[PDB]
Design an enzyme around this catalytic site. Structure first.
Site, mmCIF file in Angstrom:
data_model
loop_
_atom_site.group_PDB
_atom_site.id
_atom_site.type_symbol
_atom_site.label_atom_id
_atom_site.label_comp_id
_atom_site.label_asym_id
_atom_site.label_seq_id
_atom_site.Cartn_x
_atom_site.Cartn_y
_atom_site.Cartn_z
ATOM 1 N N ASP A 293 -7.058 1.714 9.456
ATOM 2 C CA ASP A 293 -5.906 2.034 10.290
ATOM 3 C C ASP A 293 -5.415 0.762 10.989
ATOM 4 O OD1 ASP A 293 -4.898 3.966 12.996
ATOM 5 O OD2 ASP A 293 -4.550 4.614 10.917
ATOM 6 N N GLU A 340 -3.397 0.531 5.854
ATOM 7 C CA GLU A 340 -2.457 1.421 6.516
ATOM 8 C C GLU A 340 -1.443 0.413 7.040
ATOM 9 O OE1 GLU A 340 -1.784 2.036 10.454
ATOM 10 O OE2 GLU A 340 -0.036 2.336 9.171
ATOM 11 N N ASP A 395 -1.197 12.578 10.627
ATOM 12 C CA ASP A 395 -0.413 12.430 11.860
ATOM 13 C C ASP A 395 0.976 13.064 11.772
ATOM 14 O OD1 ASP A 395 -2.228 11.091 13.571
ATOM 15 O OD2 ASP A 395 -1.728 9.149 12.690
#
Length: 500
Positions: A293, A340, A395
């Site tokens: 991430d 990401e 998300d």
């Protein structure tokens, strides 16, 4: 890396169906792998698997190494008499973390008591061997959790100074006084890794690869920050002096102050990036590929003074991404990482990503708010196709949920764009499938979709909603909800787009 042209599904283990309030590493997980195989999928993607605290977010774990005790299948234990499972009344289709906290912890503790009493020499021996092999991170994690329990759940930097600052004498005394609690936490780990290892073996037997996930920055209240203060920007009392986040933009004029402690990259470099090497070594025992991430953080990160309540006062600081991945490459002989890279990135970030051949992401739900120049539209993807396309991530809302709140412009442009790619739809519930089809027709080597889209579920199934204080990470599949027909539809799509 070389990614074959294929598809996979995104499903966090907690979302698996089954008794006792939460998905676990057992038969239902194997049923999912078999479903994925029948559907022709070759990848299963999960979210971070570490232990969680308030908020239940897998991206804010008590440890960068430990496994989530909530994912432990208690049935194998009860089958040996170690514990007597009881159902307080867990709901269907969702994880009630409050109830899970109040019920599963005691069940795990009771199982440990039963274990020490009936466990065979082989089991006792295996558990001991595990504690010894994993000591390099387990001693700190187990004592961290034991101390947290003995201090009312307070974060480590609020514990008495002798323990907080890890004075040798005090630490050794606590370890002795909490010997049973420490052993118990080590017990939850042995179980987690044993069960995950078996599941990973099952996936491999079915020709499936698992995509893991980890936040670039760890959590403030975690075992490794407490044990390695020298690796983070903290003051003598354990308080972060600077925190992670992102600059203000057209949405948050204030930006985002995540709060995570930041790495003392210079110290890490002198240590041959040992923390990261170890973090990846452990992750690679669980996954075949690992996404990180906020990947752009390896190139440069937004450093916010901890005293600032927002992210306005920050500044961009360069990180040794180049040197770190050179190290990762030499140690692992390759770089099994997915980047990401959503949001506003820079040519240097893209350069670092491509330099080590790391695939980035594309999210179809973000491709129709403007024009044909949108990077998320398939015709704009790299010809090398080394990217992973999603309809939406954990998300984002489910695609049907997203569609229902999309702007008139978005909805109209999506339909027209789909039409250009020979795709149409009639009912709104078909949009998830139309978008999944668009992704599969694209040049992206991997198309990974959340199970909620395969089921065409609405907003009630959204995994996480950034900014919302509750109802996150709770969605669960119902037994048999994924039918052979869902699988056959995915397979036919994969066959037609040559992803089998």
């Amino acid at each position: 890396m070389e990614l074959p042209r294929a598809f996979g599904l995104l499903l966090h283990p907690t979302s698996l169906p089954g008794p006792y309030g939460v998905g676990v590493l057992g038969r239902e997980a194997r049923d999912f792998l078999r479903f994925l195989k029948e559907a022709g999928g070759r990848y299963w993607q999960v979210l971070p698997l570490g232990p969680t605290g308030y908020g239940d977010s897998p991206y804010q774990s008590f440890s960068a190494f430990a496994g989530n005790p909530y994912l432990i299948d208690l049935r194998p234990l009860a089958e040996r008499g170690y514990v007597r499972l009881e159902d307080p009344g867990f709901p269907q289709g969702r994880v009630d973390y409050g109830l899970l906290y109040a019920w599963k912890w005691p069940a795990l503790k009771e199982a440990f008591r039963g274990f020490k009493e009936k466990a065979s020499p082989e089991e006792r021996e295996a558990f001991a061997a595990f504690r010894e092999r994993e000591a390099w991170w387990l001693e700190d994690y187990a004592l961290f959790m034991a101390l947290k329990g003995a201090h009312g759940g307070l974060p480590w930097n609020r514990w008495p100074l002798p323990l907080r600052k890890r004075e040798e004498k005090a630490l050794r005394e606590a370890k002795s006084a909490l010997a049973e609690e420490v052993a118990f936490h080590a017990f939850t780990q042995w179980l987690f890794f044993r069960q995950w290892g078996a599941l990973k073996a099952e996936a491999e037997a079915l020709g499936i690869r698992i995509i893991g996930d980890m936040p670039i920055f760890v959590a403030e209240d975690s075992a490794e920050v407490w044990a390695h203060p020298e690796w983070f920007h903290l003051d003598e009392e354990g308080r972060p002096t600077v925190v992670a986040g992102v600059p203000p933009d057209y949405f948050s004029e204030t930006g985002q102050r995540w709060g995570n402690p930041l790495y003392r990259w210079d110290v890490l470099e002198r240590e041959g990036f040992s923390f990261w090497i170890r973090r990846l070594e452990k992750a690679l025992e669980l996954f075949h590929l690992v996404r990180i991430d906020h990947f752009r953080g390896f190139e440069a990160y937004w450093e916010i003074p901890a005293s600032c309540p927002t992210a306005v006062e920050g500044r961009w600081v360069k990180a040794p991404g180049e040197k770190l991945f050179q190290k990762i490459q030499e140690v692992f002989g390759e770089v099994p990482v997915l980047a990401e890279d959503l949001g506003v990135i820079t040519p240097e970030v893209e350069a670092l990503r491509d330099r080590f051949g790391l695939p980035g992401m594309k999210v179809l739900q973000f491709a129709f708010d403007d024009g044909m120049e949108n990077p998320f539209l398939p015709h704009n993807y790299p010809a090398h196709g080394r990217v992973v396309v999603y309809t939406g991530t954990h998300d984002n809302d489910t695609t049907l949920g997203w569609y229902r709140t999309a702007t008139p412009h978005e909805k109209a442009f999506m339909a027209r764009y789909l039409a250009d790619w020979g795709i149409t739809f009639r009912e709104e519930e078909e949009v998830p499938w139309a978008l999944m089809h668009l992704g599969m027709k694209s040049v992206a080597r991997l198309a990974v979709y959340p199970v909620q889209d395969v089921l065409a579920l609405g907003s009630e199934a959204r995994m996480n909603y950034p900014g919302r204080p509750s109802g996150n990470w709770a969605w669960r599949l119902l037994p048999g909800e994924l039918s052979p027909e869902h699988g056959a539809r995915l397979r036919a799509m994969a066959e037609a787009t040559e992803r089998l």
